[PDB]
Amino acid sequence: FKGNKVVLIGNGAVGSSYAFSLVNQSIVDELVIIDLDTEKVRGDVMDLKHATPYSPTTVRVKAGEYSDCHDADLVVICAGAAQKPTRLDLVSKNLKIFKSIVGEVMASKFDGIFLVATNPVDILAYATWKFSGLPKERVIGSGTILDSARFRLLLSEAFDVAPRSVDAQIIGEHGDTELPVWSHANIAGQPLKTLLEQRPEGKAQIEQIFVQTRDAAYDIIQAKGATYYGVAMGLARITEAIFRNEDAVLTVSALLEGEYEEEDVYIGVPAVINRNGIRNVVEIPLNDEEQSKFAHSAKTLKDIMAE
Amino acid sequence: FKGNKVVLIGNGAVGSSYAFSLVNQSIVDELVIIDLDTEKVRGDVMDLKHATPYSPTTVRVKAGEYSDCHDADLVVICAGAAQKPTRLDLVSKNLKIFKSIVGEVMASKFDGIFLVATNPVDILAYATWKFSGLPKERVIGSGTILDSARFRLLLSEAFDVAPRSVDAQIIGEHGDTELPVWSHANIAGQPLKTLLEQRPEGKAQIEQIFVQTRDAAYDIIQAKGATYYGVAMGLARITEAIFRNEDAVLTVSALLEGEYEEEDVYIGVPAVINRNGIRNVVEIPLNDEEQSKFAHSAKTLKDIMAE
Amino acid sequence: FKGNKVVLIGNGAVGSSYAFSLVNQSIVDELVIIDLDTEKVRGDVMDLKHATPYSPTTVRVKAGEYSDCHDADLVVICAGAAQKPGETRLDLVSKNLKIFKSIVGEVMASKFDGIFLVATNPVDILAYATWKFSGLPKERVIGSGTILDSARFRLLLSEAFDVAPRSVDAQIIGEHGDTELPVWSHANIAGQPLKTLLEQRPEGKAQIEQIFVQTRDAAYDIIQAKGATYYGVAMGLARITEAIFRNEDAVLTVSALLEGEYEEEDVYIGVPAVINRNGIRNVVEIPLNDEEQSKFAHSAKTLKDIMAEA
Amino acid sequence: FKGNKVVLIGNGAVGSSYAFSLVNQSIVDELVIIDLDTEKVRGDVMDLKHATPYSPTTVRVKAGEYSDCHDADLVVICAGAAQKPGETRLDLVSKNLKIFKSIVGEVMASKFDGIFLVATNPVDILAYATWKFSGLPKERVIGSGTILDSARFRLLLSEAFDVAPRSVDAQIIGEHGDTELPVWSHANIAGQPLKTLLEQRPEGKAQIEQIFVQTRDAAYDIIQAKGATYYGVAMGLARITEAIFRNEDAVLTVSALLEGEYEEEDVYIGVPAVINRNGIRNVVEIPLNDEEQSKFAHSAKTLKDIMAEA
Numbered sequence A, B: 001f002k003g004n005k006v007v008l009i010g011n012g013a014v015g016s017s018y019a020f021s022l023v024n025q026s027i028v029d030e031l032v033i034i035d036l037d038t039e040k041v042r043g044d045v046m047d048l049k050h051a052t053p054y055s056p057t058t059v060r061v062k063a064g065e066y067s068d069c070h071d072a073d074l075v076v077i078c079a080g081a082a083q084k085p086t087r088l089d090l091v092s093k094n095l096k097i098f099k100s101i102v103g104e105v106m107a108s109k110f111d112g113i114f115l116v117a118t119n120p121v122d123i124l125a126y127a128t129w130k131f132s133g134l135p136k137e138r139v140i141g142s143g144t145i146l147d148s149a150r151f152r153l154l155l156s157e158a159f160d161v162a163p164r165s166v167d168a169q170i171i172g173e174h175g176d177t178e179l180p181v182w183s184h185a186n187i188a189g190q191p192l193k194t195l196l197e198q199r200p201e202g203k204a205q206i207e208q209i210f211v212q213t214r215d216a217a218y219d220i221i222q223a224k225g226a227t228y229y230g231v232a233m234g235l236a237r238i239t240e241a242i243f244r245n246e247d248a249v250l251t252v253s254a255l256l257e258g259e260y261e262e263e264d265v266y267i268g269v270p271a272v273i274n275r276n277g278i279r280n281v282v283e284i285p286l287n288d289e290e291q292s293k294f295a296h297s298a299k300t301l302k303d304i305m306a307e
Numbered sequence C, D: 001f002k003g004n005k006v007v008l009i010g011n012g013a014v015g016s017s018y019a020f021s022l023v024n025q026s027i028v029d030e031l032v033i034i035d036l037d038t039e040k041v042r043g044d045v046m047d048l049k050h051a052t053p054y055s056p057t058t059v060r061v062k063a064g065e066y067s068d069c070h071d072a073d074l075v076v077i078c079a080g081a082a083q084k085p086g087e088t089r090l091d092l093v094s095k096n097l098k099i100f101k102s103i104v105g106e107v108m109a110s111k112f113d114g115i116f117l118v119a120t121n122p123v124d125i126l127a128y129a130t131w132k133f134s135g136l137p138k139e140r141v142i143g144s145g146t147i148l149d150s151a152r153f154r155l156l157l158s159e160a161f162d163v164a165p166r167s168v169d170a171q172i173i174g175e176h177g178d179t180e181l182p183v184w185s186h187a188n189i190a191g192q193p194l195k196t197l198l199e200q201r202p203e204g205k206a207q208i209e210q211i212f213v214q215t216r217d218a219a220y221d222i223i224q225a226k227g228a229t230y231y232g233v234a235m236g237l238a239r240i241t242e243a244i245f246r247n248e249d250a251v252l253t254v255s256a257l258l259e260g261e262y263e264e265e266d267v268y269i270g271v272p273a274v275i276n277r278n279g280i281r282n283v284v285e286i287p288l289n290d291e292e293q294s295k296f297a298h299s300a301k302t303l304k305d306i307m308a309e310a
């Protein structure tokens, strides 16, 4: 008869914004925050606590230590300073951080679900699955949860409708080799790419919508130095699907074992999410262009992991 | 048949966190953000937009200009860099900022409600009321919305209950002369001060609960350099009461014209909030200690305003 | 600076269930209830008021009269006894048109200038009638239409495919009635082509048929079991109410007037439409395959024929 | 990693309205409904499923049997026909005790190991009976108690003082029934002493009396008007369900077992109590003035006397 407990590890821009989302949304009743920077944790925990009397239902926020994971239900990892303006140097640094973090978490007796946000997210989700020894269902990367929302946002602007009425997806790596699933993107059945094609310079519009999706992080970083709100909201959406046992289909980074003809790689795909984590990957039809790009994205990830 | 539109002026730590609260809560469907720092606005607006596909209902976020206030329903002012480690220098700087901002807003044909967060909030709410020429009902300062939540939070910890089950208030200036209303603070009728009195060193506990309420901002600033989550949440709570026409009693900074035997001053008091702003100030019984402190707080504010 | 005010006219099974949905959801802060049966209203208004201290945000409920519509934002009509077994379709239409002429007349006489949402059956016919009786722009008169049929179809698909209903994108369009049609050319879960998947199952053609038959005949099945339906329609009415008051620009299947869309005119019928604070912003015209085109035209014809007979 | 599962036993006016509140609120993701009247259940389950595609998050509704309680988290009992006019109190208790012995017995035989929430009247008596029949710890058996009476009192005060009900802090404690009492010594709006304010009004003593009489006699007034009450109790049951599943440590007035609190023992009765995922964490013992002490003791005595007679 325990309540719902999330432990956030990494309380930087992304983690702290995620914590605030949880205070606004009341998805869970207990939030523990762990970071090497104990002064930032202390200040954020106090500031966050002071919002909780206005939370829809009780949320308890506290500064924690690894032993606090013993009975946690979800551990969210947003730890690792962002990449400074090489990919393999970043991967090496962050893999060491994850070996340490996941080991400390598992030592506490944690037996819940991991949700990973740290970049490169597909690589670090795969690493978390390997280091934790947990079933694939219980290790999730945020993957393209955010890329898909960006794609829907830009489509909602192009077509002037609620983003909740836009069904559209980005799949593949969270990064340069991601791809739009135009064969499915629609508003109540309106074929969006086909409609854009018929606009003047509609081919340019189709390209721009995806370019602005793909390069959104860069665009935000150039403007204000970091992104955090979009990721925080995506992490909260996945958190909701787990704690409310939704069986909701969300694009997240999931392990493939044969789906899409790929094996032994975490990558962004639609998957059914519920209280046990990823129930299953959803295998959707892709057109030839989509098949080509998705295979290339998976190859890219598996190559990075070999290096 | 217009939707609900908020214009935020000042997109720093406080304003941006408030914007994110609105994206999480879907209180209103349109949010316009104005700041001198147009690059931070550009980056925040993009990042915020990317969260909106997961908002409960549609929220549209855009970068704006003053003409965008013409049909705004609420204008929220969080503009002015925080005080650098004199009070009158701060007041002078911020009063000039407000004369400019409120003048530009009124020039747009704005005819809604102002909600002010910039410190000193009671002084700047009073200034906004004077500069805008609007009825007192339509100019609100956040006042002790946050101090009251801090007080309830610390009481919820002392008594181990949901903060939503703690009825407790801070009134007076948002600052050094604020006061706890212990004559009323209760959980389902349990007299909290009386119960604390009976604990060992209970007098020390009563003092600490208020000291930690009063000095919370300082404590948070010492730890992480600024506060923003508690204020953002309080601003969102007031925003909710207005747009959902609640007639909710909240402690905010309101103009007194005879209530509590005070005139011509904005100060933190319980007030009924609804779609027209502050419907009325609620005049509660105060004990002698409370009467003394509240009068002193109002005097302090009126003295600052004379200087 | 007035709040959001809904007037419900017709406080039977459907209307009372809609009122309770509003108390649970806090979409608006004021709900006024009108019915000829003033004892039921008095009793329901008290019972509903007693739930409001636990509503998410303030909801005020009161018993009303037509003068209360003067500053109403939305008038929801669920008035008219349900069709009695053996009562002819044309007899039901005749009686409900009379009721609506009266109701809409008294509403407009209050100086109401908001939006109508109609639930009473036959909903497409009575929405059209409300539009004609009221004199309002088409944007401001909405029938619940297939808001409920679409949810039923999505529910049954969510069971067939074992996922959240919110992850099923599927629609019923046409008349809220015997002539409605599934839009299988677009029904999908994250791009999964549902009809194509079903076809591959053993006796999959049978499954496809059953999913639609169970959607089409749902009201009959519920009435046979418990005598009336109300929760599904109350929830659909609440969903449309949310789209209006939260100004969502949400695409929902409702009964809307066509003036050229789908090559039809002068008929209200169930179609996807963008809903916001001004009501129906526009009808969304989606591609239909040949079978869907055929059935949709027939549904529109059927509705126009019924109205010609009335 | 199982989800949150509620089993409702008793799908009449109260239970069905509670089910619909769960569909509106998405407190839990699975709702199973059990009743002797399997046709009503079949019809209600379909109607409710059709609302779920518009629920905030997934809610699965199904018709159930007792074996489905094995992994239920909460069993809510709203079973028993309401008391018939002229039927004696002792006759009603006798019949409902029999029903409860049967229901609780079949639930425990499923290997259920969750929490009971009981609504059936007389609720304090039947909560005590559920505690005794089930063998569970007192924390895990809760009667709705004065959850509804408190909301009624707050509603009437919110009208008297013209503010949001959520801003009125006021409570009814004691038996859910004739012997309940208002806690005027604490009823306040942001510290405003409500009884003291009312006393100062002309005929204010009359107003104070009427506010309580209208609270005490609300069910009678609603039944006289429309034959049964259900929305207020459904909403109160939903509020307790929320406190449990969201682990709130919220203070709510419910029927709880006293073992020394208020100087009473061996009785369930309406009191403020902290509610969280384990059920009733503790009873809150608040100061009562002399009049409140007198009435509360009398209410507890009345309940113990009724149980002695049964």
Ligand SMILES: NC(=O)c1ccc[n+]([C@@H]2O[C@H](COP(=O)([O-])OP(=O)(O)OC[C@H]3O[C@@H](n4cnc5c(N)ncnc54)[C@H](O)[C@@H]3O)[C@@H](O)[C@H]2O)c1
Residues within 6 Å of the ligand: A009, A010, A011, A012, A013, A014, A015, A034, A035, A036, A037, A078, A079, A080, A081, A082, A083, A097, A100, A101, A117, A118, A119, A120, A121, A142, A143, A146, A174, A226, A227, A228, A231
């Ligand atoms: N959509 C996405 O998946 C997405 C979006 C934005 C950012 N990111 C990534 O999220 C990560 C964090 O970004 P940020 O902007 O919040 O960075 P940040 O620098 O603000 O925060 C990183 C935090 O990690 C902490 N940390 C480092 N090592 C730790 C350890 N061993 N144990 C506990 N804490 C540790 C640091 O103290 C710091 O507080 C980066 O990898 C960034 O690229 C991902």
Ligand SMILES: NC(=O)c1ccc[n+]([C@@H]2O[C@H](COP(=O)([O-])OP(=O)(O)OC[C@H]3O[C@@H](n4cnc5c(N)ncnc54)[C@H](O)[C@@H]3O)[C@@H](O)[C@H]2O)c1
Residues within 6 Å of the ligand: B009, B010, B011, B012, B013, B014, B015, B034, B035, B036, B037, B078, B079, B080, B081, B082, B083, B097, B100, B101, B117, B118, B119, B120, B121, B142, B143, B146, B174, B226, B227, B228, B231
């Ligand atoms: N509870 C409260 O009332 C409370 C709590 C915390 C902070 N505050 C106050 O809120 C204010 C903002 O704090 P912050 O931490 O967000 O500061 P910040 O420095 O992060 O942001 C201030 C913003 O105001 C903008 N600005 C300045 N002049 C402007 C003008 N003329 N027009 C438009 N924009 C202008 C700046 O560009 C900057 O983006 C301060 O007064 C702070 O003390 C109040």
Ligand SMILES: NC(=O)c1ccc[n+]([C@@H]2O[C@H](COP(=O)([O-])OP(=O)(O)OC[C@H]3O[C@@H](n4cnc5c(N)ncnc54)[C@H](O)[C@@H]3O)[C@@H](O)[C@H]2O)c1
Residues within 6 Å of the ligand: C009, C010, C011, C012, C013, C014, C015, C034, C035, C036, C037, C078, C079, C080, C081, C082, C083, C099, C102, C103, C119, C120, C121, C122, C123, C144, C145, C148, C176, C228, C229, C230, C233
């Ligand atoms: N999806 C849908 O559009 C849908 C679903 C279910 C029911 N319905 C329809 O909704 C309508 C109501 O069904 P119900 O089961 O609630 O019926 P009901 O008999 O329970 O209630 C009808 C109410 O209308 C009131 N009424 C009749 N004439 C009136 C008038 N002139 N002014 C004010 N009130 C008047 C009656 O007094 C009664 O309370 C029926 O047409 C039914 O077929 C539609």
Ligand SMILES: NC(=O)c1ccc[n+]([C@@H]2O[C@H](COP(=O)([O-])OP(=O)(O)OC[C@H]3O[C@@H](n4cnc5c(N)ncnc54)[C@H](O)[C@@H]3O)[C@@H](O)[C@H]2O)c1
Residues within 6 Å of the ligand: D009, D010, D011, D012, D013, D014, D015, D034, D035, D036, D037, D078, D079, D080, D081, D082, D083, D099, D102, D103, D119, D120, D121, D122, D123, D144, D145, D148, D176, D228, D229, D230, D233
């Ligand atoms: N605030 C409150 O605690 C409150 C408020 C209103 C009503 N009530 C009480 O709630 C109870 C239900 O009222 P209602 O109006 O919903 O009654 P109802 O007659 O509409 O429903 C009672 C249901 O119980 C079912 N039932 C009877 N015996 C059963 C058994 N052995 N197993 C399974 N199901 C069985 C019946 O088939 C029926 O569907 C009554 O005791 C009533 O007085 C309590």
